[model samples]
Structure formats: structure tokens, C-alpha cells
Target chain A: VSRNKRGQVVGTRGGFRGCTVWLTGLSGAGKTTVSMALEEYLVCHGIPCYTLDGDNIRQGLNKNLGFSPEDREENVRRIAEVAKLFADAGLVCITSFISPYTQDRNNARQIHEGASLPFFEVFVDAPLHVCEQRDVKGLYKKARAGEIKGFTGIDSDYEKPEAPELVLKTDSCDVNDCVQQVVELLQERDIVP
Target chain B: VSRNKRGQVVGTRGGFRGCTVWLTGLSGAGKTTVSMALEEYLVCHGIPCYTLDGDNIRQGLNKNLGFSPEDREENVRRIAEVAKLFADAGLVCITSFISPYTQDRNNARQIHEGASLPFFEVFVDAPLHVCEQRDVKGLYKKARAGEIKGFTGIDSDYEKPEAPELVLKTDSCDVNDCVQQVVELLQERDIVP
Candidate 1:
């Protein structure tokens, strides 16, 4: 362990410079799968990491928010801010969200970078048809049946990232391969050792 | 490092069990002081710990909230939930808040304990007059001058914990002594090493 400029001990949990790995895509674009895999990998390697997904966050932090455009933006905003907190606390925060808007995702990145923290945006990319076919949560089927209105990629828009830090082809790569790619990126960025 | 029942790595960050040290007290009662010292002690000892306080939280996560009764309750509720998230992520989350309501503090404890996570409530106790004299933020003077209405201990009530896990007499004890007391409690509970 070494003391930082503030005379505080850091790097106690391995060579961990707190960061956020944001996975954004459609509902079935394999964000959760890859995020969990990466989280397990990081934690198993003695680098503290945690995944923030809908299951844990929606039920607690963003419970009051609905899926309207403004509400969705606010939801992403809160998640981004919480991710910032986790990062500040020296944890590699992995956020898996269907953050379909470019502006919202950019805002998430800006908040982290504004704090001089590392932010990696990994676009878990899959064709809309492929995602519909996957239908992991059957969300697409419900949206198609007119049971879910204003659903992303069905009734609403999904603004893709123009210049993300990283892009993972979830359709072409398996979960293990995707995790490897992320781990490699983290290593390259010196966020993990 | 050790693995838990699910075979995931558990103690990579030392013999640190994720927990919350909830510091509730009146303003100027030294909750933030003790909490920060405890956080530094734990982190400097190679344990991952983070302190959640108003400065970091109010500007971001609870930015939408106001000073109404319901908003204050919601603010405490969100902080409790966020602390739970931090604990689950394998950090000793230290929360310092003027959580004056018994029910709100109880809910925070129940939420953590229900998840089988450890929660230690530490009442940073001091007489109202002592706290007012401290006036760390000059809030007491403002309240006395009829500037800040509904101020705790002035216009509103500050409920004392009936049976908290620990109590610190900030009126008598020094900050170092208070921190040592909390560290001893954490060690006795096997939350830190």
C-alpha cells in the first residue's frame, strides 16, 4: 500500500484506481450478462468491483421514476451520479442500463470525467432484429403485441453512441469473450493490474 | 482472500465484512467528525471504507429533495438504501446524517439487517444546549434569529435513539477517543481487522 498526496492509504485492494464501466444498449443487447461476468472476474481477481443494474437500482434508487423521456433522463442521471459515488469510494462500478439516448450516456461520461475519474462506455451492440429475436426478458414480444408503449427500439428512439470509449459486439462475441475485452481495456487503461 | 458460500471471492479487501456504521445525531454532535475519522482509520488499515455525508450526497443523489417532513424522510431513506448498496459492494459504508426520526433510523436498520447485512447505529449524543453552542454550521444561530424555520431542536423535534448499538458522548470525549471507541466496536463485531 502507498499513501496518496492526502496522506491516505490507497491501492489496498490491488492496483485499483476507482472507475466506472458503463454498458449501454437495447433491452436484450447482453449488457447485464457481460457486466456480471466482468464483475465476477474483477472481484475474483482481488480488484473490488460491483455491478449496478435495473434489478438492484430500479427497486431502490430510481423507484420513483417512470419511463417517460424526462423521467428516463432523470433515471440515467441519478444512476450516473450514484456510479460516480461508488467510483469515488474506490470501487470499479459496472453499470448495465438500456441508456438508449446519446445525450444521457454522454452526460454520464461527462459527470465522471468532470470529477477527473475514469469512465468507459461500452456499447453492447446488437442489431435490433437480433435483440428482438433474443428477447431475454420477452420485452420485445410484449412491445410488439402493443402491450408496452414507448418502449425503446419499438415505440421510441435509441440514439447510438457516436464515439464511445469501447464497443462490444454482443451478437458476435460470447459473454466470456466480451468480459475478456473489457478486462483487457481496463488493463490497458491501467485501471486494474 | 477467501470465497463465500457461492464460491465468489469475499475477503480480498482484508478481513472486511461489508457493513454500515450509521451515525445519527443532532447538528454539531460530531457525527461527521467521528464517521470521517473511522473511515480514515479503516482505510489506512488496508480496509475499504467510505463515508456518506451531506456534502457529497445532497448535491447529487438527493438534489431534488427539499426540507419538508416527507422530503427529509425520503432523503434519509435514499441515503440508507445507498449505504446498503455500498455495503453489499464490500465496503464499510459510514453514513453521517441528522436522521432525527426514530422510525426512519429503524427502517434503515431493518433494510440492512433484513438483507443479512450488518448495521451498527451509533448515536453521537450531546445535550441540545451543547450542540447549539457548538453551532458548527451556524445553523443554531440562524434558527434562533428566526431565519431558518423548522430547524431541528428549535422548531422541530430530534428523536433520540432508544437503544442504538453504540453511543458516543461527543460533549465529553475527544474526536480521537470517539473514533477509537467506534473502531473497537467494529473490531468486537468482527466487521474490521
Candidate 2:
């Protein structure tokens, strides 16, 4: 990279490095819920942040995509790239997904370049039975009725985060608790206030 | 919608309901830059949050699509749905995009379903000349070379936010000052402490 006339690096910024917080879990496991809660908590306290949820991404940018293994991989890959851009801009980016496979998650990790970027995996751990019981979207009923195929925990496998930086059991804890846990972790790592 | 056997509304409290903060501008207007700064500030202060950057989404979910008008519509649509889900889960979702068209942005507003979802359009306003001057990814050069068509300013027309919730000049203002302005607005609205 070459420096501009103003002595600024061509492709980089000074004092501007950030991290990515990835939330992975099964459907109805409160990944979106907890991730949103965390988002609000951060914003309320004046943090710069944003989120990428599965269904939302699917309905729009990934609408042409389907629920196949290949599609899922592509989906995660796209999100990782976006997250990398956010990190490059010196922003803390949080991504929530069902991210069912470790290989795909690893691919997401690889999207970032350089040492200043941090990728923290937060697992929204909830039991399948509880998730089914809490099927707010009725997705579980659809999956059970065979109306929906390729649903995580029912048809597809959801690989657990092997060494996630944080894990929260949404079924066992409240959203506030989960948010607090994430906040504490970010603070511990000096990623936040 | 039907109630569960327990007589409660289905899809209720699978935790949803919150507001959204949308950051929009031409490419390199510092939307991602400011959004990420806000993320870190909030996280450190015990607030949780997330971000959705344009480039990140393009690389993954929308990777197959091009920068055609149709593809851009689809892009924002998917992001809107995802933001809706996040808000429903009680998170303040921050999204940054070059959403050049007002119709597309209004469609995003509609995703909140009559909820008092605050669509704070923070316009990252900067002169076209300034943005082109600071083009970090050589996007301006490519657009100028006609290597890329439908570029927002050079090729395509960019519709300025008619009544943006907030507007900041990235070219003139310090990044931290611009971020502080956003924080103050959020605090005034009681969206954050």
C-alpha cells in the first residue's frame, strides 16, 4: 500500500482496529434475542455496534439462497466478509447465526486479516426440548410436522462452539443475564467501556 | 396467529421488540467507521449492540448478486427483515448501508410493523470530490475507469436523505466528534444511558 499526499496510508487507518462477536446456536435458542439485547445494551451505553441475524439476511440479501449445506456455507462466508469490513473500520461487529458447522465457523474466523482483529464466539446454549417448547416462530411445529426440512437440531446438525469466549443458556437464564454476561466479557477483554 | 396450549400468544417473548438506528451514506462516508465506534463505546459501558455493514453482506449472503438496482433492493430488504427480528428480540439494531434510494429506505421502515421503531437515518454526508479523494478501496478509480457501472455518485444518482434523523459531515468533522453526536442523540431519546 502507498501513502497518500496527506501522509495517510493508502488502505489503512491509524488508531482504528476492532473486533467481531459471533453468536452461534440452534433455532429458537434465543440467538437473535440475546444478540439484540446485547446490541441495545451497548447502544444505550453509547457503543457503536450492529447485528446480522439469519432470517433477516435470508429474506433480503440471501433471499435467492436456500437451506442447503452449500447455501449455509456461502451465507456464513458473506457475513464474515461484511463483519471483516466493519472490523477494518474499527467497529465491534456482532453476528448471530445458527452456524451449524465448525468448518463454516472457522471460515468466518479466517475472513479477518491482521492481529488487531478479535473474533469472540458466544454460544447461545439452549436445550432442544426447551427450544421446541419456546418455538415462537412455530418453526419447531413445522419441523416436527415435516412441513419444514433442513431445520437445525431437527434435520441438520448444529456443531457446538468448541471454545467460545462466552456461553449462555437462554432457556435457563433471562435475556438480561445473557446481555450482562457478554458485556462483562467485552469489558474483561477491554473491548468495551 | 393462534395461542399455544397454555393460552399464550405464539411467537411472543421468544423475546422481540426494540428500535433501529440506520446509518446511510455514499461508500467511504464513514458509516461503518462511526457505527463501529458506537459499538465499542456501548459495549464498554455495559450496553450490548451489533452492526450490519454493506460490504460484509455483499461478500457473503449477497455474494451471488451484482450491484444492479434489483440486487440493491433485495440487499436492503434482507437487511430490513433481519433488523426487524433483532428489534423484536429487544435489541437496538444499527445498520449501515449506501441505500441510495428513498423508496428502498422507506420499505425498510415498513418492516417494523407499525411499532414505534425509530429509523434514525444518520446521513454520512461528504462531498463527492472528498469521498473520491479518500477512496481507500480504489472504488472511485474503478468507477471512474468505467470498470464498474451504477456506482452511486459517479454513474448512478444518489438520493440524499430528505429528512435524515441526523446528518454529519465526515470530511470536515473528526470521527470521534461525529460519533459523540450520535451518542448524544441516543441519550436524548433515552435509547441509551
Candidate 3:
């Protein structure tokens, strides 16, 4: 295509290539841990990427939201939009959110796909037993005691992905192995070298 | 400093270098025009930048909001957070928002400054008559005809920036001149070569 008013299409350089890997799972399912691993793996190789944690996002972009169903939907929706903006700026955006609902995850996928950008939904699955064991925050204990309302994988169900683009069995794998699994897909998809 | 759990500092590469140029102005004061020109000019020379217009963001991240006075504050606030995120990932982030309130603009500045990121508040100043003449969207006409309520520089107020980082007088300068003004500043600050 000829140059437009903006002078060039966005996907023109290494710094300008944009895509998103949306990692979703239970609260202690290791989504955040895996995304951080992937971010380090990518960034070490000279790729422009960021791992946006759901908590850090809530502290800033989604601070107005709470744990209600509507608020949760809005939270994921706004995040999908932010990921699109980041991708448009040509960054490989990595996002980790519990994102318990299937519809919310679908909404995020559609947003990126609608923009004709790459979107990967990676389910970081760990058994409830495994996750509760690793619940460093004692979140499962709080949820079980009704100390925290609307906690996923406890009071609220986490609708596991029906057919996610990828799934990491965090129950058995190490961070480096999972990181390798993701970066391989990124390369196969030509998202990075 | 040693690497943390994510194991690496974020700003080690050119691809991860980002900053924000917050452009505030009248509706027809040429903020978007200058931003697009500057984006093209910078990208051609290998400096990556993207123009984040208020309208475009409202279509997504700020879509839940409206033009109410309270909602407008929330609107600009969300953009500030998002721009800081973009800048954190290291892109030349140009934001064109008719952020009329000084408090809102100040909040945006504080957000960036707090992050130790470079933030430039650009006031695109055009005389009321000059902006009205270049009003391609006929927004000024609608505002004057009582069709659009709370329009800036019309029935409503546009609190001018008391001390903006830069001011582009659109009445006499061409797009190239304004683009040069920004690019020169970027180089002076070593944001770009």
C-alpha cells in the first residue's frame, strides 16, 4: 500500500510489530508468573514487550472497578482496548488476568482479532489443589472463610477455556519450560526472532 | 541494581523507549494535524511515535464515559494513565486531547513526572477566529448555534495553560513548521537523534 498521511503502515519495523498474548486462569494458577517469564525471555532478546499484571492495572487504569460482575466485565473490556492501543504502537503486549468468564475472554479475543492483530489466549491451568498449595497470598483460605467475596475458583467458578490458543500446565512445568513453550509459538507465528 | 523476579529492567533498548507529548487545545487548533505530521517526520527518521487522539480513545478505553463535566475529568484521567503506560513501554507517545481544564492537564503532567518519564505539554493556541475558520468538523458552528453544549472557547470555558512546555500558534505556521518545532525539542532533550 502507498504511504498514507501517517507516512507508513505500523508493522514496518521490529519495534513496530504488535501482538498480544492474553493469559487467563485461576488466581493462583501461575498466569502472572508465566507472563513475567515470557516478558523477560522476549525482552532479553531485544523485543519490545511488557507484562501487564491485573493487579498493577487495577492500581492505575481500572482503579474505579471492584469485584462485581459488571465491574469485572468492564475491567477485561478496558484491558483488551488498552492491549490494542499498545499493539498499535508495535509492542508485543503480554497480559495476565484471572478473567474467570469465558465471555470476557472472548470479548478480549474479538477486540484484537477485529483490529487484524494477533491475539493468543493462553490458559495457565493448575489444579485447585496445586494452586491452593501455592496460594502465597492465602487467598484460597480467605475465600473459603468468606473473607473475600466473589473469589474465583472458590465461590465463583473459573470457566476454563474451551479451546484456548495454548495451555500451560503450571502444575508440573517450570518457569523456563513454560517460557520456552510461549516464545517458540511466538517465533513460529513470526511475532519475534 | 540486580534484576528482580521479572528479572530485568524495562528500559534497556531503543524499542522500549517511549515518551508523551500531551497536546491540549481548541477543537480546530491543529493538534492532530501537527501530531500526524510529527509522527510521520519522526518515523521516517527511525523514531517511533503514534498519535493518540481523544476521539479515537473515546471509541475504546473511554467509550463508557460521556461529555458530562465529571465524566470529562475521568476521560482525561484515563488517557493520562494509558499514555504513561505507553511511554513506559518506550514509544514516542503523542496525545491530542482537548483537555480544557488546567487541573486535568496538571494531573496528567504529575502522572508522567511521578514516573520519572519525560512529558511535554503542548498548547496548540489559535485565535478563536482562526480556529473557527479552520473548523473542518464544523464543531465551532454547531457550538455557536446552540446545537452543541459546553463547547470550549464558545459557550463553555477553555482554561488556557498557564505554563505549557511549548505552544504552537496555528494561525501563521504551516504543519511543517509545527512539526519542526516538536522534532527540534525532542532532539534538544535527547529523546531522538
Candidate 4:
């Protein structure tokens, strides 16, 4: 309970409230594409933001966890906590994960909202067949051959969000369009100006 | 390995260079005190930065870890990964931990320098007796009474950094003096300009 000696430079007077923009979807649903684009869009608009994707994250932090249900839950849990830390530091955190389980997604939502920071779950939607066709990593091909077990949208189920804050129809939209939708939502909500 | 769509806004453009400031010492040595001040100073000076402190972290992301040798190593490992993630996002990351082991600290240093980002070890040093007396959390009293075991500077050892980038003598200095040292180092190193 030591006092902040320099005093608080920020109060609710509000320059940035900090937040987590969580992107959820099946593999190849254009989450990485849209998130990267969204990061560029946000940064261009003078917002300090960073994108946390599975590609960069898997090798670190959650490297010890495998694909068991518990492991997946742990994975999402760790990311949510890390996002909260970043948000608390006054940065807009963008998280991209397949995060197919409804319970796990909501758990993340609760963590952020509990911290009194904004949490936007942006659903990057694409049909299973379309996602399989895109199979950017050929992950779907491996799952089809049974090379990878418990694969989402293949063997395991992908529980869609009953109510997410935003949804991107990747099945029939361009990257910029998807990114623009997020920017519009952010502005509409006044999460960022 | 997708190239950044926004070609880094920093690295000579001068917004921020994304580095990790590693603070190590016995608990109650004022690492947190100095690190928090440094974060405020950095942010006020327009360097996008975040403080990664063990107090706030263990309850999340690394809650699964404990104080065993392996757990301690893993704890440092996870924070290293998280700090690296923030650094990649182009934010200055200040990490304060007792980090009693030399090996664990070096692993973190390697990760940051490997990415070609500055990794400054700001050792917040004070005499063991001084630290124990200041024991803000009553942790030292608990350790002295045997309620807590393996506490660094008590039953456990805290290996000194053979060659740290910067050392703050909290034994004879004020927080502002220590903070100014770090601010000058960051400017001198050009990690933030």
C-alpha cells in the first residue's frame, strides 16, 4: 500500500482505458490476416496496440501445454492473463486464437471485464468447408488424414459464441473490410478515439 | 514468418524500440519501487512500456509455478517469454523479480539480446539486513520465524550478477535518484530517444 511517489499521470479523466480485442475462429478463418491488418489499421490511427497470435505465442509461454481439453483451457487462460497485464499497462491488446470452447472464451471475457477494462470478442467466421479449403497451414489436411487428433472442426467440436461483441464474415469479405468492421466497432464503442 | 504489414513504426523512427529492463535483487530491495518509477518516467517521456512484476504475475499466467528450483526456473522462463512477446510488439518491458538464480536470469538476457533488443539488468541492491528490515509484506519476519522457507537472503542464496548492465544502490539512495540512473541509461543506450 505504498503511495505512488510520482503521483498518477492518468486518472479516469481518460486518454486510453486499455482493452483486449479477442479474435476467435476456426483455423484459416482469416483471423491472422484480419488481426495483422487490424493492428496496422489501429496503429495508423494513432492507437498503441499489439497483436498476440498463436504463431508467435505457441513457441513460448504455452509451449509446455499439449492439445488436451485441459491443455487448451490452460492455453486460453494464460493468454487471457497476459492480455490483461498488457491492457493494465495501457495498451490495446489484440489476441487471435481458435478458442472454440464457449466456456474458455467466456472465462477470458470475465478476466478482462473483471479488471474494469473493455473486452471485445470478435468472431472471425467461416464455414468448416471454407476454412478447410483455405487450410493455410494445411492443418486441416493433417486432421483429415488423422495425423492430428482432436482437431477443431474436424474431430473435436467448435462451440461458436452464443453472443460475441463482433463477428467477421470471412466467408465473403476482404481483409480490409473485416479490419474496417473492427475499427468501426471500436470507434462506435468509444474504446478508442 | 509473415513480414510486419506496418513496417516497424519505430527503430530510428523513434516511437519505441521494444526492450526489456530486467530488475533483480533480494525481495524488499526496492526493485518494484524503482521499476514502477522507471515505468512512469518512460511513459511520461513517451516510450510505450509495461512493468512485469512477480506480485501481479504469479496470480495469473504463472500461478501454476511454485518456489521449487524447477518452478523458479520455469517462472523466470515464462516471464521471459511474455516479456519477449511485449518486446516484439515494440513496447519497453520492465520486469522485477528476485530471480535468485544466475542461470535463469541469463536465459532471459539471451532471449532479449537474441532478438537484438536491449536487455538492461537494473540490479536494485541493498544489504540483506536492510532488505529484511524493510520487508514491506511481513515476508521477512515470516521467513525468520520459519513460517516461510527457502527465502532468499535467509535459508536460500541470491547469486549476484557477475556483470549487470546497471546497478542501483538502494542502500544509500532515494527512488528518484535510482530512477534517474535508469532513465539516463535508456537515453544513453538509445533504447528510447
Candidate 5:
């Protein structure tokens, strides 16, 4: 296999290695945006990759889970396990979730590492005010109106990663730059060419 | 892309399209054996594929579930969703589960087809006596001794598929033959070369 300066696999006859890139942040912080772009970039480059975010996950496998703390914990755990399975199957797995608990994210990493699979925790950071203003789903509006309770960065906490592998300030960074940073991280970790 | 006599992809410089091969049967049937061999063949032939069995799934994403009817239903549903996700991500997902309920398997198929993803339901057929004799896990013995209740093909029902796309008589077929049949099905369905 050969590669260009961007580290993209060139004329490779095999699929790239598998790993998990977990993105955690508050709602509306651009985790989904960044992950979608990253997934497109990877797949278009002949690398197998997938993104697991609230849209596909919450409606399908995690449909039974709700906004309760216990449900949230289970949600994160299940996502971690699914991501690990994807990695074991030899595909880059990108996960975007609020995943606001430090312990939950740590547990996710432990699940992957214990299986000898690569896990990169990326904190998709944006200030609470920025996130609120960009409330694409109107979740922040519902939280402010007292229609929702225990929303992350609203009436609840958004525990920041103490030592994330990468932190993207989505409030300032464009989607392309965020994706490039993630791709670079994947290259540095040797998960891709 | 090029191919030999077999339907397997040859010299392909791209990833193959994704689909799910759901294998269902009574306990002790050759679902796991066949799926593992099929997955290996697909991967070795340069097709990205993975198998999801009780070992990987029941221990991870479905850990909270048990043998209760409700739990079993949820178990099947979650597996269906996860398999659909894998197919969406561009990998052949092979799932080996008892999945004894016809409605559950149909629901799984519906979930995939609704998303415009291909779903191949392969019934791993083996009679109760044959399955009992090959009880690799001793589960049949426990069921016979009344230590385990509601066991498929024992105290509980193992509803056969009403209209499965493929049926492998595992009691008579070897693993390689079963895998070949599945590969042929993939070819017929245009999921592979």
C-alpha cells in the first residue's frame, strides 16, 4: 500500500484497520456534524468507516432508553460495546453522543482497550452558551421552558474529559478542520494509513 | 474489480457493499459454526465481514437481557438494529442466534428492508434429537433435567421460518457446504460479486 502526503491510503488493495473514535460533548456542540464529515471523508477515501450517533442509535437499539440517569448510563455502555464490535470487525467506528459523564467515557475506553482494540476519546468542546444558541433540535429551548429536565449543560452537568486524546473547539473550528484533526489523530494512532 | 469461478471478489480495489445474513435455529444447531466459517471465508476473500453470536452480543450490548420472553424479544430487536447499522456501514454482518420466533425474525427483516438494506434470512435446520446429541454447551442436558426451563426445541418452541430465503440442513451438511450455500445466496442476491 502507498499513501499521499495526506496519509490517505493510495491504490491499496485491502481495507484499512479498525478503531473507535468516540466524540463526546453537550447537545448541539457539533459532535454529529464533525463525525458525519469524518465518516464521509474516510469512506470516500476507500476506507470502511461508520458513525453511530443519536439519530440512528436512539431510534433503533437505544429506543427503550430515555432521559433518566440510569437510561443514559446504559445508553453509553451499549454504544461502547457496539463500537468495540465494529472495531473488532475491522472498521473505523465513530460515535457521537453527549456522553456527559466522565466515568461513562472512561468505561467506554476501558471496554475497547481491554479487547486490545484502539480507542480514541475526542472531546467535542463548545461552551454551554454556544451550544444553547445553536440548539438545532430545540432541545435547549425545551430545557429552558421547564418542559425538559436534567438536560446536559442545562439543569444537569456536562463532565469534561480530563485527558481526552483530542479536543476540538467546535464553536470556532469549521467542520472540515475538525474532520482533518480527527483524521490526523487516526493516522497518528496508526489506525489508518 | 475481478472475480474467479467462485462468486468471491478478486483483485477489487474497493470495499464490498453491506448486507446482513441472519442465521436462526434451535439451540445446538450449526448456526454459530456455519456463520463463523462463512465470515472467515468472506473476510479471507477480501470482503469485509463479521459474525455476531451469543458470545459477542449476549455479553456486551445485550448483557442486561435474559431468557425471559420480554428480554428475548428485546434481545432480537437490538441485534436486528445493530446488524442493520453494520450493513449501513458497508460490511457484511453475519448474525447467529436462536431467534426462534417467526415474528421476531420478520421484524428484523422488515427493519433492514425498510432501510433499503438487504436482509437474508437463513434457517439453520436441525432436528431436536440431532441438536440434543450435539449439545456442545450441555444446554440440552440441562433442559432435559429441568434445570433450565423454556429452552428452545425442548420445553419451549422453536418456530420454523415460514418463508426463509435459504435453509441449511445442518444435521447432514458440513460447515463448508453450508458456507458455500450462503455465499451462493449472497451472489444470487447481488450482495457480493
Candidate 6:
């Protein structure tokens, strides 16, 4: 690690570099929506950001897997490992998942290199009522009706982030505000221009 | 999936989505250089791009893994899975690795969703002689001296991409040309505005 003239560790000079940002939230808490908003904000401003969503991964790479507890754990494990790879590559990876278990989130955190990469957890804090109201995909409805097994919030418990760097209440804040909060966090970490 | 007025398939579109751009090449063939260059270029042009390199991953997430063929396969498998997550999140993820095999690359391709998300194989097609001549980090020399076991292009075999979407010969083409070629390819694919 090389220090700048200001004595701050900017990065390793001419060495492989990057960081990871993970977002943990419930299904209808706007994790995907917020992540996309964050991505657009960063891209528009020339910051390289990647988003890892549960739906897309489930439909693609993790498609063969099911909604069983073991499968879910495995799913989260794979995504965590993937986020680490992106962070090492020097891209601000934004992963939004209904990562309900604390153990899984802890595992995801272990994916980062010490000091070389920074991991930020942004919790989309929306009340159950708010999420149910904005159940744009009717996921909350399905979960409540017992139509979706092992559903987060309704059936399965969601272990909230004990101490996230930032927590935006989707009920109170707009998408733009959520984006701004994340972008500010990135700037604070010096991961953005 | 929703169709547009033109009858084009439009999935749920929202925030900045991620896509995977995998860079496969032999060591010392300018994969890292080009990956970083592409990252910088995209950033400067207001495109959110991230580049993941092998050395960084070894030092972090795959720190426990060795350079044996099995380990190497596992390493690539993990990286491919991670890249898929990043891509799904809507970030243009650039991954650089001396994959050295075709099966690994194919595995990466199979992990993604439909054609809506693009998986680009960028072959840094520099000849071994040229790569050895450049020897930016003396890696090629180490490989030749048998100091680095399973070193690609020396002890390990590197299977060139059968039909890469983009091929950049760093030996002959300058960085600007390589970046232009990549940018052009991105434009052709409508990945960049």
C-alpha cells in the first residue's frame, strides 16, 4: 500500500485494486430499486458501480437451486464470494439481497481483503406496512398468503444489519434520496470521483 | 417480461443494471493493463465500469487456494459466479484472469440469463514472445524459470478464445487503440450510450 503526499493510503500504486459495497434488506424494501438508482447515479457521475440482485441471480446462475434454507444459504454464499471478486477488481459492487440471516451477511463481509478493500452495508429500512403497500411485484402479498415458502419478513426472519454505514427508510425517503445517500457514502470512502 | 411498442422484450427495468465483460488472456499479455485502462476510460467517459484482477483475488477471497489445476478451476468458478452477480446488478463488470482453459470460460457463459444481459469475451491476443519481451512484472521470466509453478503460457497451457467478441493484440496495438476497440464494441452492443 502506497500513501499519497497527504499521507493517506490512496491505493497500491500500479497494483490490482478495487472495493465492494453490499446492500442488505428485505424483499419489498426497495433493495433492487435503490441499488439501480445508486448505479445510475454513480454511472452518470463517472463512478464504476456494480449491482448484484437476488432475482437476477436466482433466474440465472443460481437457477438450479431452490428456496430451501440450505439453498438460500448456498445462494447467499455464492453471491458473497462473487462480490469479493468484484471488489478486488476495484469496482464499487452494490449487492442488494434479502440476505435474511446474520451469518450469511457475516460470510459476505469476510469476502473483502483487510484495509485494501472497503465494505459498506446499506440497509433499506422500510416498515412492513410500507413494503406491503409497495409490493409492486405482489411478493409481500404472496408471502403473507403463505403462497411463497421461506419468504423473508412474513415467514422467515430478516436479521437486520446491527450497524450499517447508512440506513435509508424507503417509507420516508424517495429513490433520489436513497441514491444520494449511497453516492455520498461512496464519496466519503473515496471510491468515487 | 414486457414488450415495447416495437415488440422488443423489456424485462423489469429500473436502476442501473450490471453486466459482465470477461477478459481472458495469457499472463503478461496486457490483461491487467487493459482492464485498468478500460476502467479509467469508462470512468472518465461517465460509464460505471469495474475491473477485477487475479492477483488481487489471490490475496483476498481465494487466499487459501493454491495454483494447482483443481484450485485454478475452483478459483475461476468462484470469480465467474461473482461476475454474474455484479453484472446482474447493472454494472459493466470487467474481469481479467489468465483462465488458461476453455471449460472455465464456457462455464462463465452458461451462468448468465438471456441475451438481454451481454457476456463479452475479450481476448488480449498478444503472442508469447511479445509478452515475454514486455514482461511488465517479470512474471513471464518467473514462469520460464519454473519458479512459478502452473504459470500460464509457460508450465500451464492457455487455450485461446475460440470466438471472442473482441480481440485486442496489445503487442501491435497501442492502449488507445485497444480502449477504442473495446469502447466501440460496447457501443455496438448498446452497452454504452
Q: Which structure among the candidates has the greatest TM-score?
A: 1
TM-score of chain A of 1: 0.93
Q: Residue-wise lDDT of candidate 5 within A1-193, one digit each (tens)? A: 1112112221133544668999998898898889888877775565656789999999999998997778989999999999998877666789999998889999999999998888999999899888888788999999999999988888888888989999999988899998899889888887767
Candidate 1: residue A104 Cα off by (Å):
1.9
C-alpha lDDT of all candidate models, in order: 0.83, 0.71, 0.80, 0.81, 0.82, 0.70
Error of 3 at A110 (Å): 1.1
The TM-score between candidate 6 and the true structure equals 0.60
Backbone clash pairs for candidate 3 read B16-B90, B17-B90, B18-B90, B18-B91
Off by over 4 Å in 6: A1-193, B1-18, B113-115
Docking class of 4: acceptable
Query: Per-residue lDDT tens digits of candidate 5, residues B21-110?
Result: 999998878888898788667755656667789999999889889887788889999999999987776667899999988889999999
Q: Model 1, chain B: what is the TM-score? A: 0.93
Chain B alone, TM-score of each model? 0.93, 0.86, 0.90, 0.92, 0.91, 0.87
Quality of candidate 4 docking, DockQ: 0.33
Report the error of model 4 at residue B192, Å: 4.2
Candidate 6: tens digits of C-alpha lDDT, residues A61-88: 5665787778778788777766765565
Q: Please, what's the RMSD in Å of model 1?
A: 2.6
- How close is every model to the real structure, measured as TM-score? 0.93, 0.53, 0.92, 0.91, 0.91, 0.60
For model 6, state the Cα shift of residue B113 in Å: 5.8
After superposing candidate 1, which stretches have Cα over 4 Å from the reference?
A1-16, B1-13
In model 1, the clashing pairs are: none
Which docking band does candidate 6 fall into? incorrect
Best by lDDT: 1
Better candidate number, 5 or 6, judged by lDDT: 5
How far residue A101's Cα lies from its native spot in candidate 5, in Å, is: 0.7
| Model 4 per-residue lDDT tens digits across residues B1-193 | 1224222442223444678999999989999899888877765664566788987899888888878888899999999999987777776789999998999999998988887767888888898889887788999999999999988888888999888999899998899999988888888987756
